[PDB]
Symmetry: D2
Subunit: 257 residues, 4 copies
């Protein structure tokens, strides 16, 4: 999408997996990309070099987004480096762990809820004034894209009740954000991955992987690369200017939304 | 519903509104009802007397369910009083306040999320072994019924982004609970009120109420009493023994689920 | 439900299965029931006698509802017999046959679409003035309840693409009916069975049945009797007076709606 | 998307409106486009010239898709012209007319159902062997994209009950098609317009247009041009290769799916 050249794109949880594949694609489109994780990954500067060689720009920011303080600092550091924000991608998140209902204590509850919900709510909040300002300047829309999940539709797997429901929370809160912040020139959409071959599912044996694939019409897990184009699509005003408040599931037909 | 006579029914947030109307109906059906709120209503003993006159029993327990410890204590007190639990109704909840996204800070976030999510997760967790034991003893199912919202479908109203999304969270977490606790003899279902004439909407002026009613095919707010039968329906093994993991919206056609 | 005594209840496809189980329950509640099928069951008079012994009344009408003329005639005959209509249950329907997409020709298409859609649309159309008149006379609501399907959510099974989509059609058309006929005093709701042990699934071998049951949290097919109480619930103004435009899935957790 | 160059794209109902805008964009991507309507529009050869000058190719085919014979002939003529099919877009359809439930006769019913359902089912059926053959040859996927509607979610408007439910039927039938034809190398997705400024809404007065816009967060109708990129996205194997069985609503936030 030609209108992504020069766009300032902050992608949380882009140190690996879906976020990283997505960041790579934005850089190829000429975007200025904020790479993010809890820790700087090894060879982060190689990644930055690849992204620059593809015609974009990149910088890494470390933050554990479970606290609002880290969310505000991430936004501030990103704006300090690139001068504003056109696109926020709330992709940071994960299972944290697996605990069945009888085992859910406050510590685990807090960990899952902070990683998956507080992170998105607060990072979006802090980014919002910047996204709105960029929209006003261009006369076109800025974009928030959050990563959902198949689990936000049908429920979390074993020990993952809080995770699935946290994703359902995101699917819903976007609806409120559309209703009252469309007037700020910001579109909100969600990419909802199914079962994707990343670190997220690395613990699964081939036997478990085969059983899941049996319930997927395409008969396989997705790749991180198969998630990325949807993010660019939702980020592009030319592509999706009249699209807001939607969830797009990418899952080989596993769940039909 | 003849199989409700003698059933031990804990109803959170039954000190007033929908929870109270529901409690009154369970008592008419001969159930032993746990009444609950943050504070005792000024005429709680008259409510209890009326429920007993109607052929049931009642006892009041005060607890702020925003903390796990309070949820555990409520369940323990209820079990000490009536000897077990057959039905848990997770009805405690509310807006807490109205704050737009820019004004959503940690303290407010925590308040809404604890009141609406942690309360349900923890009360259900602590009630579960009792519910499972009652099901095993009877060879029939126990029931968890949680109060959702139209907002859990379409998003929270102004300043209610977290509230709407918290209800979406409940709608989703029930799906995980069904998948892995159906084997424990417990059915999980949701009653999802639309716009209902309780203290929840007491702050709405006449013109605002009428604006909302314009989007309701039945042309009016619902009553607390119009919510109550669905709760008894989901609680009754005879009525709904093969029904679990469902959300039933009661809203005069305002949202069609 | 005490307000069902004397109610005039036309139940299409009540000669067997879910419709029959439902009819029996209405008669136990004291309703006057219109029994219906394409052919009289070999022991229809014994069914009628049992319904009368239970405190209700019943009369059988034969009609193939694939044509509008037959739908009009059924409604007229029912009205001639019982003097009006308080509740219409659109339960007649079925697969007709199983043909994969490449084998879906005009004749098969017409057969499935007429049996499952035209039947519902036209029977409801012809019943509507009577339902409206009954509501006007009582000052309470009349009820239309249509039988949907899990398939109307997730898609038809092998060779059943048109059937699943026909049920989706029903789920949707009710929404239009609510928007513009709530003012006529009629509530429209749907009972959506999952996998139920009737003639509908009589062609399924034991290994196919247990394979489906593996995807059902309750681990078994439902019974016709487990469907029936929901129909009475939706028919009862006292029970569901503020409920309209809803779909209630009865499926042991197989699909969570 | 670079992988759309040379692709053979049959777009039903592309003589005007959304279908036409979509066709124009495919031609700009270098695709070979089958333009279609009931009648050759005036200046159709100018349109073909514009599309060729943009680096694509085009030919027009006349067919009323209400009959299976016309659907087969359209597919045959398209394949005769371009040698195969890579992408089918089922965009032909419309209200036909507005008749409230009491006014729905067989002729009107048949008209709406044939135009909106039989057309899609039969055209897809006839295209399927070609789409499958093209997928086998390339080793990638072919695409079917059907035009849905906001009405397929929330119901048809005044006199449009059958139209809304016909769109709901399409949303559902695609699910069956995914389940059993993903193995044929074909992906099926839906673009679901909200309120778009085409001939579809040309009858609406300024007053009515303003009141509808009030329920749209973006505060305006969409344009045909705002629908087009989503079709290209769903047609591109590179963009959406792991996406199948999805509905994407394009409606300025009017309905949040
Ligand atoms: N994979 C799937 O099948 C699937 C399905 C549905 C949804 N998702 C969602 O997809 C998104 C990306 O996950 P993935 O599959 O790409 O797995 P991944 O490889 O583990 O990536 C997760 C990313 O989130 C970051 N992150 C996690 N917790 C964080 C925290 N508290 N603060 C800041 N950053 C944090 C991680 O940073 P570090 O490098 O510091 O750990 C990492 O960059 C997640 O939101 C996940 O919920 C994945
Ligand atoms: N009314 C509607 O239109 C509507 C619509 C959708 C959903 N709902 C839901 O329906 C449920 C009942 O509310 P209502 O409409 O009947 O309003 P209500 O009159 O305010 O009742 C709410 C009940 O929840 C209790 N509660 C609130 N916060 C609590 C806490 N932190 N800990 C323990 N108990 C708490 C209240 O006790 P106290 O009075 O002692 O604080 C009260 O008994 C709520 O979950 C609400 O979210 C209502
Ligand atoms: N069983 C399940 O798992 C399941 C699941 C989802 C939905 N459903 C729906 O449940 C409803 C009842 O079916 P069931 O399971 O009870 O199976 P059933 O025993 O085959 O009952 C179907 C009833 O519909 C009548 N019928 C069929 N075609 C008709 C026509 N063209 N005109 C008039 N009446 C017609 C049948 O009459 P005759 O016997 O005289 O032909 C019979 O009374 C159907 O709408 C079905 O689609 C069933
Ligand atoms: N506009 C909206 O707001 C909106 C919203 C939701 C869904 N849609 C859907 O969008 C699609 C395109 O409509 P539009 O808005 O672009 O309106 P449009 O300008 O009227 O386009 C409709 C197209 O469908 C063709 N068509 C209609 N009936 C046909 C038939 N029986 N056989 C063959 N072709 C037929 C028409 O051909 P002719 O030129 O021969 O008439 C025309 O090319 C339709 O499926 C409509 O249901 C539109």
């Amino acid at each position: 999408f030609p209108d992504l050249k020069g766009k300032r794109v902050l992608i949380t949880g882009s140190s690996q997996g879906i976020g990283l594949a997505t960041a790579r694609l934005f850089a190829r489109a000429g975007a200025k990309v904020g790479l993010h994780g809890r820790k700087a990954p090894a060879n982060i500067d190689e990644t930055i070099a690849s992204m620059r060689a593809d015609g974009g720009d990149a910088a890494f920011f470390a933050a554990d987004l479970a606290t609002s303080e880290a969310c505000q600092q991430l936004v501030d550091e990103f704006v300090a480096k690139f001068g504003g924000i056109d696109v926020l991608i709330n992709n940071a998140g994960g299972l944290v762990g697996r605990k069945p209902l009888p085992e859910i204590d406050d510590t685990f509850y807090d960990a899952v809820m902070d990683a998956n919900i507080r992170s998105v709510v607060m990072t979006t909040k802090f980014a919002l004034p910047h996204l709105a300002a960029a929209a006003k300047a261009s006369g076109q829309t800025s974009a928030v894209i959050s990563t959902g999940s198949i689990a936000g539709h049908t429920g979390g797997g074993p020990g993952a009740g809080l995770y699935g429901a946290a994703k359902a929370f995101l699917h819903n809160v976007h609806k409120n954000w559309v209703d009252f912040h469309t007037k700020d020139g910001v579109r909100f959409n969600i990419v909802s991955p199914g079962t994707v071959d990343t670190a997220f599912h690395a613990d699964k044996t081939q036997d478990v992987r085969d059983r899941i694939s049996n319930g997927i019409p395409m008969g396989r897990f997705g790749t991180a690369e198969e998630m990325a184009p949807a993010f660019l699509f939702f980020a592009s005003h030319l592509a999706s200017g009249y699209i807001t408040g939607q969830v797009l599931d990418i899952n080989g037909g596993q769940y039909k939304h």
